[PDB]
Amino acid sequence: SHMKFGVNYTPSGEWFYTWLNPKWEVIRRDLAQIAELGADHVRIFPLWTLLQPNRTWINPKALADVRRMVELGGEAGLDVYVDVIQGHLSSFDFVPSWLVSWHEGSMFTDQSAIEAQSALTEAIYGTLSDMKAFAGLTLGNECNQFTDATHPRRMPANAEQIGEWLDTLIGLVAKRCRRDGRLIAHSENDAIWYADGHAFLPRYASCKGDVTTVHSWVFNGTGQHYGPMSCESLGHAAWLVELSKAFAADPHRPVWVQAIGAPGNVIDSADAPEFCRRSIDAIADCPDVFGVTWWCSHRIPSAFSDFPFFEHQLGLFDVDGTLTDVGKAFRDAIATHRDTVAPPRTTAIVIPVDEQGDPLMRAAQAPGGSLFEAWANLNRQGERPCVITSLDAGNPAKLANRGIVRLERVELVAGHAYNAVSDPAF
Amino acid sequence: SHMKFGVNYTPSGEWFYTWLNPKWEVIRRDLAQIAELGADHVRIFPLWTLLQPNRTWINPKALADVRRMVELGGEAGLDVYVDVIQGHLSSFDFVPSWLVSWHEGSMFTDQSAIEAQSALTEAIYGTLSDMKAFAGLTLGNECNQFTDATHPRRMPANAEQIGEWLDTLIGLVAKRCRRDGRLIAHSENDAIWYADGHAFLPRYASCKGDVTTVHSWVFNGTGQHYGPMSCESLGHAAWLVELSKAFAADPHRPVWVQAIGAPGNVIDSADAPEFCRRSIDAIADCPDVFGVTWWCSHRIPSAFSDFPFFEHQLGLFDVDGTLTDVGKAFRDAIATHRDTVAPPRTTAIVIPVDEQGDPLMRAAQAPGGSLFEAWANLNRQGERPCVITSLDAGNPAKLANRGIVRLERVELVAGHAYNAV
Ligand SMILES: CC(=O)N[C@@H]1[C@@H](O)[C@H](O)[C@@H](CO)O[C@H]1O
Ligand SMILES: CC(=O)N[C@@H]1[C@@H](O)[C@H](O)[C@@H](CO)O[C@H]1O
Ligand code: NA
């Protein structure tokens, strides 16, 4: 099992505002730059407001521009994954006018909105279905943030409705994807792992869609509470990988670290290269990792305002296309880990779950929680821990299937370090 | 004093979603159709989300597309008025990501947002300043709806802050407009005239900017309470014209009926042509009317969803491009009233106001109110009433300046018909 290595593509010069009038020669250079790092894929992000400005009209020009960006990715030698619904990017919401204010509604429970997102998922897949470089689709970037209790314009949903939303949209394309050789996934931020009462449940990420996605951001309280270059912080992405597997029905389901960056609000810019290198060392020591997709390709121009300041500095390339120090670190990490194979992990911490396989207390596996710290401490001691649920602890078939020979039990104690946002202003 | 006649331009085929990828040959045909009616101007509506996707970046392609649309209006023989901030159109809000949810803010009070709207106003004027067909700008369509308490995502402001917002944005371009021969205006929905407690005040519409704008929509309770083809309904636009003048410092300031339609949620479709004709008859008998701008040019395609159903039928041309019966009525109204000059109105009903010139009770001038009905009843009787405030009533200079020789005082009685949506 060998990891893919890719980059989340932020267009240079105009960011995602480039979709209004893409500068195709710049986008061509951007993607060639990414390929020259040794990346094998990119993840790209069209805007929902431009794709679907009316509930029952999808803009053909927006679809054609997505196709053109995929085409240029292929011409650079990259596989291209497309996120369908943004939705949310870098602290900003892009919600079409037919779901705001006078037309406020929940994308998760309004049947007419669900039908619209279904039409959009089918239109994106159908537009791209003939492209050799089109590698797969994700429903959208961290869509669960819209339903969290923290959201200022929350779209309500209970957990059963979220399950139906995922099943509906994934089920539109899952059969096509498997027959065509493409991937279908969905993406939640870490509230799915950490926030008690959150309507997206851990098993949804680990059982629905073809691969589990995790987005690893140590500004979530981990870097603040333990230190930016602590083992808890450097190992955070590996923790999410191993945590997610506890909730998977498939004992070797791949886990995609679909976004990870070195955020300057907690990690000193001089440490970001080492953070990159050592975070990927830790990821590479987890079996069945689908790939690592760094956030992000290009710095945000300083002309653009209201981003959390660190978001500007996340790029592997600066605004002119020059490689940054983190870019150099990621390039070297790809070369280092192209054929790293991780050995099985055989000591498991046990997460108490209910009869449906859901955590009794997600706060216990959040930064500062008893389960979070049990894993981190076994990790620091060199024991390479994995994670199972209490239900599977009594299932020798799955245990033997994963090669687990030792169990570690701890009680639930909530952590209080978790940050649901990236910046104090939110 | 002669009226201009124009149309609010809704692009055929794709509505304002056309701004994503304008079909310029279709837009050229749209504007040629409008000119063939005998219209002399159009009002057009760029989208804020496309113009200013970041607080400190205005999209040059969006500016250039506005310029191209103005150019084609001129080539069709039309003057083009541009609304800067949409903002709000036909029940939908278009608010950039940097002012919503995690970035929620008030366009009326957040200084950084005010500076962004200032940059956008200057960029629109500067982009269009060399265009012969560019006739003027309005800050945006019914922007006050964002601060109304009825709005589900309200942008708060008190009346003093609204006044400063207007003064700030208008003052950016007012001198340039006067020097270049163009107009600067702002636009509120009728909450400014009717909604007690609303932070936009009547005198703002009648004193700030170069001309008063009124948008006349009888689904506001007038048609429901009196009947869609009652004199109260047919005269509602003329009423807004004459009511607005009471709060104007300038005794001959022009009043622009900048939007008026025959909404099918209260007016039977078979009656809409007569509603058009007779509403304009009443408007044409008010002096100092800048113009009448019908809502709207082209019907919204039935493929588009979530509009109030009546919005689909407001266009003068059908989805196939054929002239509707209301379009024929508007075309004939232009021919009828191109050279109508309204004589002075000399009998005034008096609006009690406080020392700042604000109504003591806006509900009394709202549908169902005593002042609203006193005007409609005098107009129905052929008395051609105008409107002054109680402050005016003890100012012989202004009274003489407007030619007012008779006053009618009426006791305040609140109306209850007003619909804010
Ligand atoms: C409002 C806010 O800051 N949201 C951020 C989001 O932009 C980011 O993608 C995510 C990563 O986990 O973390 C959230 O807290
Ligand atoms: C939410 C809603 O219906 N808003 C409408 C607005 O679209 C219309 O332009 C205006 C005309 O006066 O009346 C408001 O009530
Ligand atoms: Na529960």
What is the compact description of this entry?
The PDB classes it as hydrolase. Two copies of one chain form a homodimer. The first copy, chain A, is an alpha/beta fold and 426 residues long.
What's the CATH C level of chain A? Alpha Beta
Task: Tell me what portion of residues of chain A adopts beta-strand conformation.
Answer: 5-15%
What oligomeric state best describes the polypeptide chains here?
A: homodimer
Q: Return the CATH architecture of chain A.
A: Alpha-Beta Barrel
Order of helices and strands of chain A: EHEHHEEEHEHEHHEHHHEHEHEHEHE
Structural class of chain A: alpha/beta
Description:
- It is classed as hydrolase.
- The entry lists the keywords Family GH5, subfamily 18.
- It forms a dimeric assembly.
- 2 copies of one chain form a homodimer.
- The first copy, chain A, is of the alpha/beta class and 426 residues long.
- Chain A has one domain: TIM Barrel (Alpha-Beta Barrel).
- The first copy, chain A, is built from 14 helices and 13 strands.
- Chain A has helices at residues 24-36, 48-51, 60-75, 111-128, 159-180, 191-194, 202-207, 222-226, 231-234, 236-245, 272-284, 325-337, 370-380, 396-402; strands spanning 4-8, 41-44, 79-83, 88-89, 92-93, 134-138, 183-185, 212-216, 255-260, 289-295, 347-351, 386-389, 406-409.
- Chain A has an 8-stranded parallel β-sheet with strand order 7-6-3-2-1-10-9-8.
- The longest helix of chain A has 22 residues, at 159-180.
- Chain A is globular and about 55 Å long.
- The complex binds 2-acetamido-2-deoxy-beta-D-glucopyranose (2 copies) and sodium ion.
- One 2-acetamido-2-deoxy-beta-D-glucopyranose is lined by residues 90-91, 142, 189-190, 215, 217, 420-423, 426 of chain A.
